[PDB]
């Protein structure tokens, strides 16, 4: 999952962005979920640094 695609997924689901893990980027294959790192739940979303305040991890499927 490219960093471009993670960022693209971020912008699409930004309104649903939360500390609870996102649904997954894809239904088939390997994707990504994302969430706001809990220490950053109070920050306005345009002030969440991608590197520090957003958690990702793979979402492995077939």
């Amino acid at each position, epitope marked *: 999952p490219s960093d471009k695609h993670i960022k693209e997924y*971020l912008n699409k689901i930004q309104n649903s962005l939360s500390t609870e893990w996102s649904p997954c980027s894809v239904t088939c294959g390997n994707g990504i979920q994302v969430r706001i790192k809990p220490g950053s739940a109070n920050k*306005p979303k*345009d*002030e969440l*640094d*991608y590197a520090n305040d957003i958690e990702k991890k793979i979402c492995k499927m077939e």
Partner: antibody
Amino acid sequence: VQLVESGGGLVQPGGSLRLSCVASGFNFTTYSMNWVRQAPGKGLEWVSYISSHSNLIYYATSVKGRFTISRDNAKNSLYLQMNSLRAEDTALYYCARGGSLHPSAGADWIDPWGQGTLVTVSS
Amino acid sequence: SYELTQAPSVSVSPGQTATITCSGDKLGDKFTSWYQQKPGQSPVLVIYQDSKRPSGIPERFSASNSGNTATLTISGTRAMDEADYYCQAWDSNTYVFGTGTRVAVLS
């Protein structure tokens, strides 16, 4: 969506100026804002960035230490304090809206822009 | 500082396809945006995130970004497309604009 600049005018090298920008047509408190300038007949040059609650500020090397970006989200306004002005700061200064997520997260374009306000710095 | 390079001028006959280049050391790794600016007017967004068009922009615009080159393509160039086209990217907490390509439409 409208972004109306003002405060532009003529001034001499060493002087100071305060540009304003009143935003309407969207939720000001969820978008980062920018200043971009354009010398007459030349290209676009970004100037400064301000996040929605003013906790993240960036300046171009060409302006760092002389210009200061600020905003008053209750007055839906974006300011730029310009000090120690130089001739080459002569440009049209556009107030243009940034992304609703941080540029490091892909929201790294500028849209829309304002008609601009002219600043001429001349001896 | 990161430099985005562009050809200063391009000339195209109506109905022909125009290609505007934009170089960068590894521009493929960055999202590119494209702006259109007509004389006496504010710039306008025509491409965000390499190829997405802000709906409001005709389908004859389309853009790519791979390796060290992003490319705005205007197929069937109309007269109203005559303007200056700027590429743009994000680097080191900076917005970076290319020198701009003044596309002339020989109408």
